[PDB]
Amino acid sequence: HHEPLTPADVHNVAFSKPPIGKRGYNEDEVDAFLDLVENELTRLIEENSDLRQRINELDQEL
Amino acid sequence: HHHHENLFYQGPLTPADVHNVAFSKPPIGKRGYNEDEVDAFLDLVENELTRLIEENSDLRQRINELDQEL
Amino acid sequence: HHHHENLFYQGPLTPADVHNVAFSKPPIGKRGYNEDEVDAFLDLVENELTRLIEENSDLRQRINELDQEL
Amino acid sequence: HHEPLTPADVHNVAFSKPPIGKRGYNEDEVDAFLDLVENELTRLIEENSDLRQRINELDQEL
Secondary structure, three states: OOOOOOHHHHHHOOOOOOOOOOOOEOHHHHHHHHHHHHHHHHHHHHHHHHHHHHHHHHHHOO | OOOOOOOOOOOOOOHHHHHHOOOOOOOOOOOOEOHHHHHHHHHHHHHHHHHHHHHHHHHHHHHHHHHHHO | OOOOOOOOOOOOOOHHHHHHOOOOOOOOOOOOEOHHHHHHHHHHHHHHHHHHHHHHHHHHHHHHHHHHHO | OOOOOOHHHHHHOOOOOOOOOOOOEOHHHHHHHHHHHHHHHHHHHHHHHHHHHHHHHHHHOO
């Protein structure tokens, strides 16, 4: 864990309140959707690096 | 890459989902998140997800071409 | 309630999303979840989400009718 | 936390492996989607009970 947009950016984004006196977006909904986002960016980055590793192995055999 | 290629990607979150996700208003009389900031952030999300899915598809195409050469 | 009423619900997960969500296969050469079991579970999810959104809409209609009577 | 389908059922569901020798569904994807599911069922149940509370308050005023 400690070694354009990153999963960490999604984890850390912080939003202000709506203007006076607006209401804004439900925070539970936005939170839950951003958790899906963070999970899927992370998984795609890991899977992309695995494909890249496989590519490396295949080039070494070429 | 282009703006309207079907890459036949299978996963539970697509750029179209990010683009179309809807949020209700908060429970009254709590307030929620600033809508401008969330909208702008989700545009960046749509862009990054698009790029990673495009990268996924290209790495898979390259692996198929290699697997052909081998 | 019926099977094709637009309740104008706003939220980030709808019955249609549950119905249409797609999953890729696992990273090779790990295996994943049984597809029959996941499919059946997600049908129950689609049903429960539908019922709760319908309940949400009826409670809101009742609150509007009360707010009219007051 | 300790007082048809429940959020807890989503939290606890456990799936077997695919048949020999099938591959099945990606587990990171299913996990992340079930987390969104659990979150949204929980939030709708809480919000529904709040609407019901408001209804109670309004009937008391009728």
